[PDB]
Ligand SMILES: O=S(=O)(O)OC[C@H]1O[C@@](COS(=O)(=O)O)(O[C@H]2O[C@H](COS(=O)(=O)O)[C@@H](OS(=O)(=O)O)[C@H](OS(=O)(=O)O)[C@H]2OS(=O)(=O)O)[C@@H](OS(=O)(=O)O)[C@@H]1OS(=O)(=O)O
């Protein structure tokens with residue numbers, strides 16, 4: 470138990486993979502739980518054709534009540550799973566951006582900087598920022614797809630988030646602009662990457 | 665263009681896969697549109713840092729209105745995709761069930777009734793029923809997490825629906841009564857089948 474939780478998922482299993490699998494295991498488990506309740510309810514239905522109405526009514530409430538508890542257990546479980554996954558995705562995106570940023574700095578702070586090395590570290594950094602950009606747009610696109618009202622409310626926040634990302638890229642590039650020659654040299658190579 | 669639509673998706677592609685791929689193409693398409701509007705909106709703020717309030721305000725309302733419209737298009741388009749997919753799934757499930765029932769009946773009516781085939785046919789039929797059953801559960805199960813209020817309103821319907829299926833199955837198993845003998849040899853094997861929690865393809 471506690472020990473298995475500590476080790477957690479094996480390294481051979483990615484977050485995405487483990488996430489789908491946990492989602493599948495949870496769904497499969499709740500599908501069975503619900504089915505059992507439904508069959509008990511059906512069995513009670515057959516058995517009670519002749520009890521008085523008040524008792525028939527109580528039986529119905531009993532099962533509708535058990536199902537409510539189950540539906541609420543289901544919702545919480547899902548919400549948590551979805552919540553955890555979203556957090557790990559954001560963390561991975563931030564971690565990759567920071568890693569790439571450090572790599573870009575190193576290449577820049579090299580006794581004799583190397584055009585190829587700097588350019589590739591910059592591509593890496595730009596890609597991490599783009600992945601944050603895609604992620605921001607996809608989340609918004611999705612809420613718009615399933616919840617119009619909710620999408621209208623995050624609209625301005627998304628717009629601002631994309632701006633925050635752009636400013637980070639301009640500021641990070643500016644660092645390359647601290648080396649005129651290097652800047653000019655990578656100019657056409659840089660532009661292609663941005664566009 | 666009309667011709668390609670007549671043909672529709674290749675038979676090789678399942679309804680589930682086509683649906684998924686379609687959802688993904690729409691996701692990418694819409695993400696690109698939204699990105700263009702956001703870029704135009706950012707660019708506008710920039711060229712408006714030295715203008716009158718009213719004008720700057722009207723800019724906000726302009727781009728936010730374009731997005732309202734875009735959000736509405738995305739939501740409607742998604743509802744249409746989901747409706748089409750659901751209607752086809754329900755059709756697909758009824759079709760495979762009816763096909764498996766005919767196959768089970770044809771193996772029971774076979775001049776020299778062969779157990780291997782009768783049993784296998786029964787399995788395909790149970791698998792078709794299992795499929796409708798799981799779909800009912802899985803759906804009710806997802807609604808329960810999305811809109812609890814709506815899940816509460818489905819309870820009875822699901823309960824009734826699952827009973828319909830179980831009763832259908834018992835009725836269909838009643839076809840093995842015309843041949844009380846065959847039922848014997850198969851008695852055990854059928855018992856295990858109906859007692860499973862889930863039937864995959866087999867071995
Ligand atoms: O760092 S990675 O380039 O490996 O990307 C991992 C994260 O990418 C997502 C989507 O992020 S997004 O770009 O912001 O939209 O999923 C992407 O990768 C997974 C597979 O990851 S895996 O770890 O190497 O197993 C793909 O799933 S799958 O198709 O391989 O089954 C996604 O394809 S798709 O989402 O099904 O279309 C792929 O998306 S994408 O092609 O990059 O657009 C994140 O998952 S997500 O946020 O739930 O969509 C991944 O974050 S994660 O923590 O690794 O799960």
Ligand SMILES: O=S(=O)(O)OC[C@H]1O[C@@](COS(=O)(=O)O)(O[C@H]2O[C@H](COS(=O)(=O)O)[C@@H](OS(=O)(=O)O)[C@H](OS(=O)(=O)O)[C@H]2OS(=O)(=O)O)[C@@H](OS(=O)(=O)O)[C@@H]1OS(=O)(=O)O
Pocket residue numbers: 678679680681753756760791792794795796798799863864865
């Ligand atoms: O061509 S099919 O009619 O078989 O459709 C294939 C897709 O069916 C799903 C989902 O259902 S759907 O939305 O109606 O398409 O899975 C379901 O069907 C497959 C095949 O079952 S079957 O009727 O014998 O053909 C089952 O897989 S398996 O049991 O053969 O291993 C699924 O059972 S299970 O979920 O794997 O336990 C069955 O799910 S369900 O309970 O019937 O809803 C798609 O897979 S799914 O999206 O993971 O559910 C199939 O897509 S696929 O391209 O065929 O893989």
Ligand SMILES: O=S(=O)(O)OC[C@H]1O[C@@](COS(=O)(=O)O)(O[C@H]2O[C@H](COS(=O)(=O)O)[C@@H](OS(=O)(=O)O)[C@H](OS(=O)(=O)O)[C@H]2OS(=O)(=O)O)[C@@H](OS(=O)(=O)O)[C@@H]1OS(=O)(=O)O
Pocket residue numbers: 611614615684687742743746749802803804805806807810811
């Ligand atoms: O009306 S529902 O409550 O069922 O909502 C339907 C939407 O649910 C998503 C996920 O929404 S999310 O939680 O906001 O991310 O899809 C999920 O459910 C549908 C159908 O659910 S059900 O009860 O089985 O019928 C599944 O479609 S289907 O495969 O069953 O045909 C989704 O699987 S699939 O990838 O679409 O094939 C299932 O996704 S998941 O397994 O939960 O990850 C929405 O899809 S979404 O674009 O991923 O958000 C559904 O469509 S919706 O029109 O946006 O509501």
